[PDB]
Amino acid sequence: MTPSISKDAPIKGSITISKKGATFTAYKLLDATKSGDAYEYSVNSDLKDFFNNSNYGSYSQESIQKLSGEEVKEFAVKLHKYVLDNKKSGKELTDGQKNTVDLGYYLVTEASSDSEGAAVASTPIIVSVPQVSGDSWNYDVTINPKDNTPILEKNIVKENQRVKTSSENIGDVVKYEVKASIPVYQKNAQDIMYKFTDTMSKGLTYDEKTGFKVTSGDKVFAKDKDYTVEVKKQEDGETVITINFVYENIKAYAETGITLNYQATLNKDVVISNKENLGNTNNIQLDYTNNPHVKDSYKKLTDKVTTYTFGFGITKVDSELNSKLLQGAEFSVKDESGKTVAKYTYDEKGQVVSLSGNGVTNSKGITTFVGLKEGKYLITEEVAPSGYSLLKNPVEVTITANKDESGKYTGAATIEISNGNKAGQIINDISENDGNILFNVQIENHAG
């Protein structure tokens, strides 16, 4: 595999790191030593007690050779902590210049910016000196690191994926995850703010029993030490939640960022529609100190996700007089599985309430089953209205959720009869007074 080592191979190499005005530290992880016609690696003396240590991640010589992007970050946080704890130090590297170093394997992390404003740390780098290049060893490695911009992103976590949009039933949990950049500053820096404001719309009930789980990779921060959670239910029905941090407590974990895990539940105030609409929204905002040397110097970040749900009416009707609207018919709704999970309806006042058993058709022919996500749904007649027979087969509708060109839900939906039952028929929608919109499955009943 590896190229031969020349006789005129130097015992020294170099790292050059081009930047505008930030200094990097390089930590010798492993020595590379010439032996015959190959470089043998072994752990450096300074980190003998860092390696294979349970308080610093049980990193072996071999395990650092196959770190994922996230694990290189986690490794850097744990190396930093060791170096601090043991009052050691890496080599400071001059910006733009050649830096002479022994042959080895190196962590390179940002030590500073010369900027006063909030910086994002460049992601940590593991580099071999020398490294293979063509069929030769390069002893003089150059690294231009990625110039990182601030991250704030919110996602719904569903089925072990992360998506900007979703659909659920009323009563179901929407789970959330927020990743964020932790800003870095110069060493003297004071009165640093790092503050989240999460805003949930009226349709979502924050699960404060479950609460927040706040994490930077491996680390689990403690409530009322590292952060506080204040919750304010607004007049308009929105919940505003504040997650405010002691910056000093998260500073040592800057390279692994902040992760928030929290969840809400879909409630009866939910926006229900079948046109493109805003849905049931979670907004996240991060405010943080920009220039700590000037007061009221902040930068803002925002993300949002949204969650949709749908509904339909039944309109029960006579076979040959479609204008004759039948009271007293009783309906149930099952999914693909066979759960009667459909258990929310509108009442006579026009407000969403839990449905006790069957949907009973009112004097205008109507019962409703609202707050359903997309899927196959089986409308079965459980009781025939007086003077009518039981419908034999269930009417099946498939509600299909519209996507935009990135495959986000838009909030639009279509409905169709899907099991070919000629008694079922899709008619014009039901417009509720709260401005929610339901599908309308017209269903014909014969009088014997």
mmCIF file of N, CA and C in Angstrom, residues 333-395:
data_model
loop_
_atom_site.group_PDB
_atom_site.id
_atom_site.type_symbol
_atom_site.label_atom_id
_atom_site.label_comp_id
_atom_site.label_asym_id
_atom_site.label_seq_id
_atom_site.Cartn_x
_atom_site.Cartn_y
_atom_site.Cartn_z
ATOM 1 N N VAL A 333 -64.988 4.788 11.842
ATOM 2 C CA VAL A 333 -63.860 4.950 10.938
ATOM 3 C C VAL A 333 -62.678 4.153 11.475
ATOM 4 N N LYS A 334 -62.137 3.273 10.633
ATOM 5 C CA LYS A 334 -60.900 2.559 10.909
ATOM 6 C C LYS A 334 -59.808 2.936 9.899
ATOM 7 N N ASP A 335 -58.551 2.738 10.298
ATOM 8 C CA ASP A 335 -57.382 2.877 9.410
ATOM 9 C C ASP A 335 -57.023 1.537 8.728
ATOM 10 N N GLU A 336 -55.935 1.525 7.953
ATOM 11 C CA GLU A 336 -55.338 0.288 7.400
ATOM 12 C C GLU A 336 -55.229 -0.845 8.421
ATOM 13 N N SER A 337 -54.673 -0.515 9.588
ATOM 14 C CA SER A 337 -54.455 -1.471 10.686
ATOM 15 C C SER A 337 -55.760 -2.117 11.179
ATOM 16 N N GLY A 338 -56.772 -1.286 11.424
ATOM 17 C CA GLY A 338 -58.005 -1.699 12.108
ATOM 18 C C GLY A 338 -58.140 -1.155 13.523
ATOM 19 N N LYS A 339 -57.670 0.077 13.738
ATOM 20 C CA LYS A 339 -57.913 0.817 14.979
ATOM 21 C C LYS A 339 -59.029 1.823 14.724
ATOM 22 N N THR A 340 -60.045 1.837 15.587
ATOM 23 C CA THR A 340 -60.999 2.955 15.653
ATOM 24 C C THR A 340 -60.356 4.131 16.400
ATOM 25 N N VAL A 341 -59.299 4.681 15.802
ATOM 26 C CA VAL A 341 -58.478 5.722 16.436
ATOM 27 C C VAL A 341 -59.148 7.076 16.180
ATOM 28 N N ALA A 342 -59.831 7.191 15.037
ATOM 29 C CA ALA A 342 -60.666 8.354 14.724
ATOM 30 C C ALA A 342 -61.690 8.659 15.825
ATOM 31 N N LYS A 343 -61.351 9.588 16.723
ATOM 32 C CA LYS A 343 -62.206 9.904 17.875
ATOM 33 C C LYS A 343 -62.253 11.405 18.211
ATOM 34 N N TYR A 344 -62.375 12.251 17.184
ATOM 35 C CA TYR A 344 -62.696 13.680 17.369
ATOM 36 C C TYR A 344 -63.666 14.173 16.290
ATOM 37 N N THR A 345 -64.630 14.993 16.701
ATOM 38 C CA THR A 345 -65.702 15.472 15.821
ATOM 39 C C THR A 345 -66.047 16.910 16.178
ATOM 40 N N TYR A 346 -66.801 17.568 15.303
ATOM 41 C CA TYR A 346 -67.383 18.875 15.605
ATOM 42 C C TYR A 346 -68.731 18.703 16.302
ATOM 43 N N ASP A 347 -69.030 19.595 17.250
ATOM 44 C CA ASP A 347 -70.348 19.656 17.906
ATOM 45 C C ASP A 347 -71.222 20.781 17.334
ATOM 46 N N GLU A 348 -72.463 20.872 17.817
ATOM 47 C CA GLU A 348 -73.500 21.759 17.245
ATOM 48 C C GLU A 348 -73.110 23.237 17.321
ATOM 49 N N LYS A 349 -72.394 23.607 18.385
ATOM 50 C CA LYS A 349 -71.816 24.946 18.526
ATOM 51 C C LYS A 349 -70.675 25.198 17.535
ATOM 52 N N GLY A 350 -70.020 24.125 17.094
ATOM 53 C CA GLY A 350 -68.993 24.206 16.059
ATOM 54 C C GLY A 350 -67.605 24.228 16.664
ATOM 55 N N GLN A 351 -67.373 23.336 17.624
ATOM 56 C CA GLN A 351 -66.104 23.244 18.335
ATOM 57 C C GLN A 351 -65.692 21.789 18.461
ATOM 58 N N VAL A 352 -64.384 21.533 18.431
ATOM 59 C CA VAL A 352 -63.887 20.170 18.300
ATOM 60 C C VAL A 352 -63.932 19.516 19.674
ATOM 61 N N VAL A 353 -64.633 18.390 19.752
ATOM 62 C CA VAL A 353 -64.754 17.616 20.987
ATOM 63 C C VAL A 353 -64.414 16.160 20.712
ATOM 64 N N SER A 354 -64.105 15.432 21.778
ATOM 65 C CA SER A 354 -63.840 13.998 21.688
ATOM 66 C C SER A 354 -65.147 13.284 21.353
ATOM 67 N N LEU A 355 -65.047 12.239 20.534
ATOM 68 C CA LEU A 355 -66.211 11.498 20.052
ATOM 69 C C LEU A 355 -66.297 10.218 20.860
ATOM 70 N N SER A 356 -67.459 9.968 21.455
ATOM 71 C CA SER A 356 -67.596 8.941 22.489
ATOM 72 C C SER A 356 -67.537 7.529 21.902
ATOM 73 N N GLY A 357 -68.409 7.252 20.924
ATOM 74 C CA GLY A 357 -68.372 6.001 20.149
ATOM 75 C C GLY A 357 -68.495 6.241 18.650
ATOM 76 N N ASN A 358 -69.726 6.185 18.140
ATOM 77 C CA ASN A 358 -70.016 6.333 16.709
ATOM 78 C C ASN A 358 -70.347 7.774 16.331
ATOM 79 N N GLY A 359 -70.016 8.147 15.100
ATOM 80 C CA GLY A 359 -70.454 9.402 14.536
ATOM 81 C C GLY A 359 -71.917 9.299 14.193
ATOM 82 N N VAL A 360 -72.743 10.134 14.823
ATOM 83 C CA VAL A 360 -74.193 10.124 14.613
ATOM 84 C C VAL A 360 -74.559 11.294 13.716
ATOM 85 N N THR A 361 -75.281 11.023 12.633
ATOM 86 C CA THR A 361 -75.586 12.055 11.644
ATOM 87 C C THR A 361 -76.687 12.962 12.172
ATOM 88 N N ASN A 362 -76.462 14.270 12.075
ATOM 89 C CA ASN A 362 -77.419 15.262 12.568
ATOM 90 C C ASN A 362 -78.550 15.459 11.565
ATOM 91 N N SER A 363 -79.407 16.453 11.796
ATOM 92 C CA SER A 363 -80.601 16.656 10.962
ATOM 93 C C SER A 363 -80.289 17.136 9.547
ATOM 94 N N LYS A 364 -79.045 17.554 9.308
ATOM 95 C CA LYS A 364 -78.588 17.914 7.967
ATOM 96 C C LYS A 364 -77.787 16.796 7.277
ATOM 97 N N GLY A 365 -77.805 15.592 7.855
ATOM 98 C CA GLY A 365 -77.156 14.422 7.254
ATOM 99 C C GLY A 365 -75.736 14.169 7.733
ATOM 100 N N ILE A 366 -75.213 15.069 8.568
ATOM 101 C CA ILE A 366 -73.771 15.218 8.768
ATOM 102 C C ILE A 366 -73.311 14.623 10.102
ATOM 103 N N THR A 367 -72.292 13.771 10.037
ATOM 104 C CA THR A 367 -71.333 13.577 11.128
ATOM 105 C C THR A 367 -69.919 13.854 10.593
ATOM 106 N N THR A 368 -68.982 14.172 11.491
ATOM 107 C CA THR A 368 -67.601 14.480 11.107
ATOM 108 C C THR A 368 -66.617 13.685 11.940
ATOM 109 N N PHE A 369 -65.518 13.290 11.301
ATOM 110 C CA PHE A 369 -64.362 12.697 11.967
ATOM 111 C C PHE A 369 -63.146 13.535 11.576
ATOM 112 N N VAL A 370 -62.709 14.413 12.474
ATOM 113 C CA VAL A 370 -61.665 15.391 12.162
ATOM 114 C C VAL A 370 -60.351 15.018 12.840
ATOM 115 N N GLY A 371 -59.270 15.642 12.397
ATOM 116 C CA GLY A 371 -57.964 15.458 13.023
ATOM 117 C C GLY A 371 -57.317 14.139 12.662
ATOM 118 N N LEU A 372 -57.348 13.811 11.371
ATOM 119 C CA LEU A 372 -56.745 12.587 10.846
ATOM 120 C C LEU A 372 -55.617 12.930 9.883
ATOM 121 N N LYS A 373 -54.509 12.193 9.963
ATOM 122 C CA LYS A 373 -53.446 12.293 8.955
ATOM 123 C C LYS A 373 -53.843 11.550 7.697
ATOM 124 N N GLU A 374 -52.973 11.548 6.691
ATOM 125 C CA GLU A 374 -53.297 10.900 5.418
ATOM 126 C C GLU A 374 -53.198 9.380 5.520
ATOM 127 N N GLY A 375 -53.889 8.699 4.614
ATOM 128 C CA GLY A 375 -53.969 7.241 4.616
ATOM 129 C C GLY A 375 -55.300 6.730 4.101
ATOM 130 N N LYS A 376 -55.391 5.403 3.980
ATOM 131 C CA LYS A 376 -56.649 4.697 3.721
ATOM 132 C C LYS A 376 -57.499 4.734 4.992
ATOM 133 N N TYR A 377 -58.771 5.091 4.855
ATOM 134 C CA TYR A 377 -59.725 5.066 5.971
ATOM 135 C C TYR A 377 -61.023 4.392 5.533
ATOM 136 N N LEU A 378 -61.552 3.516 6.393
ATOM 137 C CA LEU A 378 -62.742 2.710 6.093
ATOM 138 C C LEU A 378 -63.921 3.284 6.869
ATOM 139 N N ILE A 379 -64.865 3.874 6.146
ATOM 140 C CA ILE A 379 -66.118 4.341 6.723
ATOM 141 C C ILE A 379 -67.105 3.183 6.632
ATOM 142 N N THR A 380 -67.485 2.659 7.797
ATOM 143 C CA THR A 380 -68.491 1.601 7.913
ATOM 144 C C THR A 380 -69.759 2.190 8.533
ATOM 145 N N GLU A 381 -70.923 1.805 8.018
ATOM 146 C CA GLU A 381 -72.189 2.113 8.685
ATOM 147 C C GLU A 381 -72.449 1.072 9.778
ATOM 148 N N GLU A 382 -72.569 1.542 11.017
ATOM 149 C CA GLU A 382 -72.783 0.675 12.174
ATOM 150 C C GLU A 382 -74.272 0.575 12.498
ATOM 151 N N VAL A 383 -75.004 1.685 12.347
ATOM 152 C CA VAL A 383 -76.460 1.697 12.476
ATOM 153 C C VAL A 383 -77.125 2.423 11.301
ATOM 154 N N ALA A 384 -78.120 1.765 10.708
ATOM 155 C CA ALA A 384 -78.908 2.354 9.623
ATOM 156 C C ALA A 384 -79.914 3.323 10.223
ATOM 157 N N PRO A 385 -80.168 4.465 9.551
ATOM 158 C CA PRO A 385 -81.203 5.374 10.026
ATOM 159 C C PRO A 385 -82.594 4.795 9.824
ATOM 160 N N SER A 386 -83.550 5.266 10.613
ATOM 161 C CA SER A 386 -84.866 4.635 10.697
ATOM 162 C C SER A 386 -85.554 4.579 9.330
ATOM 163 N N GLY A 387 -86.066 3.397 8.985
ATOM 164 C CA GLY A 387 -86.676 3.149 7.679
ATOM 165 C C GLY A 387 -85.724 2.712 6.577
ATOM 166 N N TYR A 388 -84.421 2.672 6.872
ATOM 167 C CA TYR A 388 -83.391 2.301 5.897
ATOM 168 C C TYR A 388 -82.706 0.990 6.293
ATOM 169 N N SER A 389 -82.110 0.338 5.300
ATOM 170 C CA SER A 389 -81.328 -0.874 5.510
ATOM 171 C C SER A 389 -79.901 -0.506 5.885
ATOM 172 N N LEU A 390 -79.170 -1.484 6.414
ATOM 173 C CA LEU A 390 -77.729 -1.367 6.558
ATOM 174 C C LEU A 390 -77.093 -1.456 5.186
ATOM 175 N N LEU A 391 -76.287 -0.453 4.855
ATOM 176 C CA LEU A 391 -75.205 -0.597 3.884
ATOM 177 C C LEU A 391 -74.367 -1.845 4.182
ATOM 178 N N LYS A 392 -74.022 -2.601 3.143
ATOM 179 C CA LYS A 392 -73.354 -3.900 3.300
ATOM 180 C C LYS A 392 -71.850 -3.719 3.408
ATOM 181 N N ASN A 393 -71.280 -2.990 2.453
ATOM 182 C CA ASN A 393 -69.837 -2.743 2.418
ATOM 183 C C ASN A 393 -69.466 -1.384 3.034
ATOM 184 N N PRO A 394 -68.262 -1.291 3.636
ATOM 185 C CA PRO A 394 -67.754 0.020 4.020
ATOM 186 C C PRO A 394 -67.309 0.848 2.807
ATOM 187 N N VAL A 395 -67.565 2.155 2.851
ATOM 188 C CA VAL A 395 -66.985 3.101 1.896
ATOM 189 C C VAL A 395 -65.559 3.382 2.352
#
